[PDB]
Amino acid sequence: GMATVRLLDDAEISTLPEVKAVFDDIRATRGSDFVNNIWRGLANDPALLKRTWEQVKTVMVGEGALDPLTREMIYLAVSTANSCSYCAHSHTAAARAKGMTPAQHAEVLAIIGLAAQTNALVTAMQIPVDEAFLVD
Amino acid sequence: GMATVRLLDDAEISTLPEVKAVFDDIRATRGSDFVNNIWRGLANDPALLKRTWEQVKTVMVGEGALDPLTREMIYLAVSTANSCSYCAHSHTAAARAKGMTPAQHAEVLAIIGLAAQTNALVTAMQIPVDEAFLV
Amino acid sequence: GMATVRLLDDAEISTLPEVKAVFDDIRATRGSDFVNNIWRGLANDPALLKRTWEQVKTVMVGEGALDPLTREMIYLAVSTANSCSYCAHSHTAAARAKGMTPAQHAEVLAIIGLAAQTNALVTAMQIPVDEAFLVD
Amino acid sequence: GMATVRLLDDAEISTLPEVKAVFDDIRATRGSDFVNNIWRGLANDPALLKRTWEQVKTVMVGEGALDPLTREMIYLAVSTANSCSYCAHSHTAAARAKGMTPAQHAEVLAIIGLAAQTNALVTAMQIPVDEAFLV
Amino acid sequence: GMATVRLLDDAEISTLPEVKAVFDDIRATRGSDFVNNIWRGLANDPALLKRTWEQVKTVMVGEGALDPLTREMIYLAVSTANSCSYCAHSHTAAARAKGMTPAQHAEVLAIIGLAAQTNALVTAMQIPVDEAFLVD
Amino acid sequence: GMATVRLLDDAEISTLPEVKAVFDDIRATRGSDFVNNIWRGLANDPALLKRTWEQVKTVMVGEGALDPLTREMIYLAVSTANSCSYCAHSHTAAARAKGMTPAQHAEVLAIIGLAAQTNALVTAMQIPVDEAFLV
Ligand code: NA
Ligand code: NA
Ligand code: NA
Secondary structure (H helix, E strand, O other), rough: OOOOOOOHHHHHHOOHHHHHHHHHHHHHHHHOOOOOOHHHHHOHHHHHHHHHHHHHHHHHHHOHHHHHHHHHHHHHHHHHHOOHHHHHHHOOOOOOOHHOOOOHHHHHHHHHHHHHHHHHHHHHHOOOOHHHHOOO | OOOOOOOHHHHHHHHHHHHHHHHHHHHHHHOOOOOHHHHHOOOOHHHHHHHHHHHHHHHHOOOOOOOHHHHHHHHHHHHHHHOOOHHHHHHHHHHHHHHHHHHHHHHHHHHHHHHHHHHHHHHHHHOOOHHHHHO | OOOOOOOOHHHHHHHOOOHHHHHHHHHHOOOOOOOOOOHHHHHHOOHHHHHHHHHHHHHOOOOOOHEEEEEEEEHHHHHOOOOHHHHHHHHHHHHHHOOOHHHHHHHHHHHHHHHHHHHHHHHHOOOOOOOHHHHO | OOOOOOOOHHHHHOOOOOHHHHHHHHHHOOOOOOOOOOOOOHHOOHHHHHHHHHHHHHHHOOOOOOOHHHHHHHHHHHHHHHOOOOHHHHHHHHHHHHOOOOOOHHHHHHHHHHOOOOOOOOHOOOOOOOHHHOO | OOOOOOOOHHHHHOOOHHHHHHHHHHHHHHOOOOOOHHHHHOOOOOOHHHHHHHHHHHHHHHOOOHHHHHHHHHHHHHHHHHHHHHHHHHHHHHHHHHOOOOOHHHHHHHHHHHHHHHHEEEHHOOOOOOOHHHOO | OOOOOOOOOOOHHOOOOHHHHHHHHHHHHHHHOOHHHHHHHOOOOOHHHHHHHHHEEEEEEOOOOOOHHHHHHHHHHHHHHHOHHHHHHHHHHHHHHHHOHHHHHHHHHHHHHHHHHHHHHHHHHOOOOHHHHHH
């Protein structure tokens, strides 16, 4: 296929208790029977699959200091700066599912573009850290 | 110096009308006298200085989609993923000044670490885009 | 095509002695008549093609401090961190050809994910280098 | 300070039972008293500290696919390609402590430089994936 | 489609004065009726579209310290180092349109490869900045 | 030290015939006695030192497609986008020594910032490649 690993289908996963447990938890957690490809590739290693899902579930689900949409927008900006194409798609879809409006999307993009610009400029100028930033 | 350009000080900026216009605008906009070093470096090219500041005002300052703190936390996240040291400092400072609490900072860091990991894993596996995402 | 440069075929390469010399050496070295696309794009500039191949041959082939499989796993991790999609494919194939097991692959992935995480966290925290790391 | 978070010292960690549990576990695991600064930064968020340490133990410590040194050299390579200065230092130190010799270090650097170059060249040419790799 | 945003067509754009103004300026500036996809995705947010185009027009068009071809080659090298696949294509096409020869292209590639190599080596070695570089 | 390898000084290089050959060649090539620290780090692996220098001479030095300054400015741009601090310094210095003026430096920075922004925006939107670019 196009991944460097096999993408496991539901039929195979039902024969793999460790993997089925994780996939059913994803579905129960997300409120949808759709589980996206990232998980189907991680499924080749049950231990990694569970470590990754447990993190995602802890960080991105439940009460916390930031609302779920805000968390997805941060995830989307990070995915972009890391130039992960799949991640740009999945987290844009997830942001939309968590209520991201066109207006909000446009602003997220604007920030990602501006930040990339100023980051590059700072790096080219080798701006030293202001001493005011270093006070305890 | 330590930068690859000179960092213009206030004394020099006094006699540079196009540049003082921006520094005045920055100070008038942030309510403070302190202008950080990025701007002092950009000041070598008054046009680029103006363009950069205009973008920052439009995107970052005022009524808009997202609150100022949310914008700043997205800005911090980008700065980290792009590996810019100065920028991590500057935008951690900005987010705090815009009211980022310890609790919020901890969750931003957790999201940044987690996204770094999944991004890396997806890239290694070369996961193709779900047809669902394309409809 | 899809590359920003032409991909040279065997028929054309046989008319180009400088390029044919390199391609035949790749085949002799690798023990296979298959030469992958990277080389076919580099072939547009014979000098660059030979500089690149000579490096690859020196670093990745022959006795050295690390075994060939270990070298490919490092190459694969680097390719990933540099987000080169083609390189993720080619070096996963090369790692497999050099004996990488499913278990080993899963561990390489695990390290790449964990390292990306801790690298990001360190960068966000701007952790200063421990003085113990700086002793001569 | 120089970090964007405080680096908890042993005195503070003494009275932080969830955090001392991890520092004790780290020390008990590495056989040494020295815990590097990354952990002291992570200690501000005891949960993230625990999660990060659990991953490191599972992936990096003990019987597994690859020897500990090989794991460390892959970790070093990633850290370099991601451009993390602290991490280059920390994992060069770890690899040496796990027995990386001058000769091995030189070859890792050579591979890292070479991969950087070919990755860059492939990206510029936008080489499509061979159909062979997809069967 | 394949973008995470809609790509606006000419028919729709003619109903959107703000967006049509920008697109016609691109065409007038570039001397061609072809406007590439980046602009059609930015078109979902007129304000961002105009901010981006105004920058591009100011920096990349008109008299300045560097000739237009040189500007495109720098843009292409940056795009590559940022691993933006679309940008590698568009700026290679733009460089060619501004007169880039095969010989020049090969040299740009050579520099991009070499720089990526030395940058990686310096980073792995953590080479400290020579004091000679720090004199005012 | 501050580097993860030792930086060989001229005294050590005196008695290292393969390495002095390169340092002599570098100095003979640049017309100057000053050899920057990158080479002193590479000198730990004489073979890698030689390979790296051979590439630099072939690509960067002499008659070729592009003038030496243009090559250096492309090299600077790459170094910035790859986020290498030392390299930003070294290649800003090289470009100046090869005649980069304030005006040229300002435009390089402007291009680097602009490309960073559009690259980021294209990646976020996942713009597909125009069929025009593929004919
Ligand atoms: Na002054
Ligand atoms: Na204390
Ligand atoms: Na000495």
